[PDB]
Amino acid sequence: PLRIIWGTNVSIQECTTNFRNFLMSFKYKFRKILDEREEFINNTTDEELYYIKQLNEMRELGTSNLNLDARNLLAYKQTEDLYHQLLNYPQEVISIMDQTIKDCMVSLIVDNNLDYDLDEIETKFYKVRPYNVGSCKGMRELNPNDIDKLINLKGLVLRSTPVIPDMKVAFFKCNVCDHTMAVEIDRGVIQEPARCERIDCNEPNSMSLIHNRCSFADKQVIKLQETPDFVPDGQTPHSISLCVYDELVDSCRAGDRIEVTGTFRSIPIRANSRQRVLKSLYKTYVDVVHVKKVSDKRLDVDTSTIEQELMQNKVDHNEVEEVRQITDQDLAKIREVAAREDLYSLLARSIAPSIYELEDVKKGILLQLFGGTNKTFTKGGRYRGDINILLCGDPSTSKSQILQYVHKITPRGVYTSGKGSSAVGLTAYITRDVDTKQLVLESGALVLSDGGVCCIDEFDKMSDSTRSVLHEVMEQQTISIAKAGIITTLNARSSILASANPIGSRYNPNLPVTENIDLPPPLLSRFDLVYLVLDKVDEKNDRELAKHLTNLYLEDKPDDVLPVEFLTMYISYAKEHIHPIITEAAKTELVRAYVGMRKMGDDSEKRITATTRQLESMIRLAEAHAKMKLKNVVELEDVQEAVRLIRSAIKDYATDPKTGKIDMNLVQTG
Amino acid sequence: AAANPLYGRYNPRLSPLDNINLPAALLSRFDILFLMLDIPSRDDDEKLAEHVTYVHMHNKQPDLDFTPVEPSKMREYIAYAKTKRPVMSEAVNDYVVQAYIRLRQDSKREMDSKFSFGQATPRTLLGIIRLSQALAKLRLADMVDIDDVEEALRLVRVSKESLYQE
Amino acid sequence: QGTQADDLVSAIQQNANHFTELFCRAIDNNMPLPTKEIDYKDDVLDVILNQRRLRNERMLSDRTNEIRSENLMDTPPSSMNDALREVVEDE
Amino acid sequence: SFDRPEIYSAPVLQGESPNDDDNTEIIKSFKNFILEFRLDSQFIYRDQ
Ligand SMILES: Nc1ncnc2c1ncn2[C@@H]1O[C@H](COP(=O)(O)OP(=O)(O)OP(O)(O)=S)[C@@H](O)[C@H]1O
Ligand SMILES: [Mg+2]
Ligand SMILES: [Zn+2]
């Protein structure tokens, strides 16, 4: 009748037939009608055979990994049971799926009589990587009956071990007759031959294992800090160990947010090194099957920071994607949206729809997200287009909401608070690993946020010693550590977004701007944009803000703004493909603006005088504005907009040049 | 949170900002701040004295015209109230907006005077909305009424201004 | 009712660790058949336990079948079946 | 003050193919000889 693997409900023949029928007959319209998306169905994408075309392009590029969405299995009628079998029994079902992929690979070239050779396909090993296997349940909510099941976990990578050689074939040689054999590992156990296999030599205990002749596989252990969707009462964040093997080794860097799907494993741990006695309480971990580093809600990583990592990814053939793919239709949409005359206001308005107005603040945040162009000298110098923003403001001005939004939108930033962080915790430290009892180096908040935005709330409350770490980060985008364990230069290419209050917790018009900000000039000069966010009471402004806040609570789930997915992919495309350059007309405008504001600083501290870092900030903001409009050159109007944003951020029009005071009524428009 | 003024005893000579050693950002986070003044009087102290002596003598509460709700019964009623998810309509939103505008203008007027209790912020508006939703939750209603908003407003007003005026 | 019953509550109170296993034995002795049939949405532990129960039944049936195939006496049907189940559950 | 851990087994899979030199197969062949041998018309060793 029906043959079933013991301990499962899995039939090999039934699973192969169901999965092969799924591969031959699945269309994405089934996924659309599963997700109750009928109006979004289009013929040209959905009607074509999805897994057939992925198999075809997988043959054409020579790749061996297939990414399988498990939700698609639940979409198809015949493979509804196969979805539950894949979740419950991944070890057998995944092997069955690999065999079925290889069968479809040979069948596609035999059936269509293609010129591809069968021997080259047969020698390759094909493996499938399932993902989106279910909801990201809490890791601590899993039970022992969930062992050896497929799970999803969202997490932040803290650190990874070096590559570990895991023995797969053992090489033995006879000491007397130099007779060699190779034995393949079986479930973690290698059987030493007690005697020589050759008929001539039969010396007992004569086979010695040669450690360098025998073959190994790559194994890496990564500490992942889980960020589950649901957190119960009084739960603190935890770190789990996840094991990656073979091509997935070194795919994940410290400080990036990933979707891990893998099997939930448990092993007994030896109580002592010399003893073979094991502990009854098991240690749990995840054997990783697939890693997703791309989210549609947030931006992708800056590829200028991972160029060599992309090269090593191509060498290792891991086939893990750091960046989302841009199709032709959505690229055409990007080019059409970039042609809009209201592009700046549309992009800034779509930053934080929940936050009302703060137009110039949103414009500065958008320019920080875009960034200036990155210039690397052939001699060895390096310029980074990272924009640092300070938001000094009165209470209840939604700047913490702005920092929260930026923390959600960035690929790998870190959110920190004033006096909740130390100088050591920002850069790097040494911890004792639980598994190995070894001292290991672990990155601090600034190094983890490299390639992203480090948001610092309550920046006014930070200690001066903790503040003084940020100088090298803001100016050189690096930290030069000389400590007992580490003496090296670490890249921290993190744009800093800080939020702060005045001394009296509210802005005092009697005091000048510098006293209200209360930052040392070396620190405050390194900020590209300083925003004085003020609360002016008006009839129309308060009425509009109150209406905007009350429209949120009309319904349980709450102009025209771009969607967050299109916003993220547009900023991603502009950062990846646009590297604007300064022209002569921009150069003369930059020089004239810097000279003019230096002349304004000549008048009699009370005021923030112009300094060369403001010229650098003008260059960076002009490059960011040019990158926004997809232009490959920085011309005069980009520099004018950068200068205008710098003037409006500090409210230089409102303040009096001589006194340095700000009067609320006579110029300010809320 | 429970606190004392800066001098330990409240004095009417100083501003209520002055003798409250609390920054404006931390002040704005508190949805309700109750000034609780110990003002001696012949009639109000006698009621307190008879209440406390009755509690010390019969080990229980004086007034026999009402029965206190047991803490477990209160806990389950509050749990059923917390299950509710009220929403606001157009009329209560308009009334809340007008109240917030009046509060902001009144605070701007009081800023120069000693009567000031701070500056009204959007956090004050959100606290009013939050209190109205809590009062709607107590009535186990899926909507917020005018009367709940007025009760929230009167709680906010008698929290600080009313006792300091007396 | 008037019938004599041991103090089970007190005996459980003094020696509960034994009575856990006694209650488990009593429950396993009188376990109703499942009205539902096992599908692919059941737990892995449930299908493992179902396969173990089916295996136990199959070994019992195979043992009694081959012992009947022996016919080692060529000889009371019900007493024969009682001795048969006695030897099969012991082997 | 706990009791012994207990060790027990149950046959599940077929295992490796039987070998003639294995003790269990020799015992099975001896058992078959005892049960099934016929001298003239009788099971002489079974009856004995
Ligand atoms: N301009 C605004 N747009 C939208 N919502 C706002 C605005 N200003 C205040 N709010 C609301 O008021 C709340 C107050 O929180 P925040 O303004 O983020 O606090 P804050 O601005 O960081 O000021 P602090 O904490 O005293 S430094 C926000 O969560 C919003 O719900
Ligand atoms: Mg804040
Ligand atoms: Zn040898």
Annotate B115-135 with DSSP letters as a single string.
T------HHHHHHHHHHHHHH
Q: Are residues A52 and A76 in the same domain?
A: yes
Name the DSSP letter for residue D21.
T
Resolution of the experimental structure, in angstroms: 2.5
CB contact under 8 A, A554 and B108: no
Residue A157 CB coordination number (10 Å):
23
Residue whose CA is at the smallest distance from ligand 1 atom 5 = A355
Q: Are residues A215 and A121 in the same domain?
A: no
Q: Does A3 touch chain C (CB under 8 A)?
A: no
* CB A417 less than 6 A from any atom of ligand 1: no
Q: Are residues A215 and A87 in the same domain?
A: no
**Is the distance from CB of B147 to CB of B127 less than 8 angstroms?**
no
**Is the distance from CB of B88 to CB of B143 less than 8 angstroms?**
yes
CB contact under 8 A, A81 and C47: no
> Token pair for residue A309?
């990592």
Query: Using N-to-C axis directions, what is the helix angle for A612-628 and A359-370, rounded to 10°?
Result: 80
In angstroms, the CA A385 to CA A371 distance is 5
Q: Are residues A172 and A98 in the same domain?
A: no
Give Cα A539 to chain centroid, integer Å: 43
Q: Which residues neighbour B89 within 8 Å (Cβ) at sequence distance 6 or greater?
A: A554, B143, B144
In angstroms, the CA A638 to CA A641 distance is 5
In angstroms, the CA A477 to CA A385 distance is 10
Provide the sign of the torsion angle of the four alpha carbons A498, A590, A516, B116, taken in this order: negative
**Is the distance from CB of A241 to CB of A69 less than 8 angstroms?**
no
Range of the domain at A67: 2-135
> Token pair for residue A650?
């500090």
Q: Amino acid identity of A229?
A: D
Which C residues 18-77 touch A at CB under 8 Å?
Answer: 38, 40-41, 43-45, 47-48, 51
Q: What share of chain B is helix, strand, coil (3-state, %, to 5)?
A: 55, 0, 40
A495 vs chain C: nearest CA distance in angstroms? 49
Half-sphere CA count of A248, side-chain side, radius 13 A: 21
In angstroms, the CA A407 to CA A404 distance is 5
Place of tokens 């009682």: C82
Q: Alpha carbon of B78 to those of A603, B72, B75, B142: distances in Å? A: 64, 10, 5, 15
A300: closest CA among A572, A570, A628, A565? A572
A155: closest CA among A263, A254, A287, A297? A254
Residue whose CA is at the smallest distance from ligand 1 atom 25 = A395
- A37 Rama sector, left if φ>0, alpha if ψ -120 to 50, beta otherwise: beta
Q: Amino acid identity of C20?
A: T
- Binding region of B for ATP: 4, 29, 123
Contact yes or no, B with A (3+ CB pairs under 8 Å): yes
> Near ion ligand 3, which residues have CB within 5 Å?
A 174, 177, 179, 196, 201
Q: Are residues A161 and A241 in the same domain?
A: yes
In angstroms, the CA D18 to CA D10 distance is 18
Q: Are residues A11 and A67 in the same domain?
A: yes
C40 vs chain A: nearest CA distance in angstroms? 6
Q: Are residues A148 and A80 in the same domain?
A: no
> Token pair for residue D37?
């041998």
Q: Are residues A78 and A54 in the same domain?
A: yes
Q: Are residues A151 and A273 in the same domain?
A: yes
* CB A397 less than 6 A from any atom of ligand 1: yes
Give Cα A370 to chain centroid, integer Å: 16
Q: Are residues A152 and A111 in the same domain?
A: no
Q: Are residues A171 and A285 in the same domain?
A: yes
Tell me if residue A650 falls in helix, strand or coil. coil
Q: Are residues A140 and A130 in the same domain?
A: no
- Residue A267 has phi, psi (to 5 degrees) of -135, 150
**Is the distance from CB of A101 to CB of A130 less than 8 angstroms?**
no
In angstroms, the CA B93 to CA B74 distance is 30
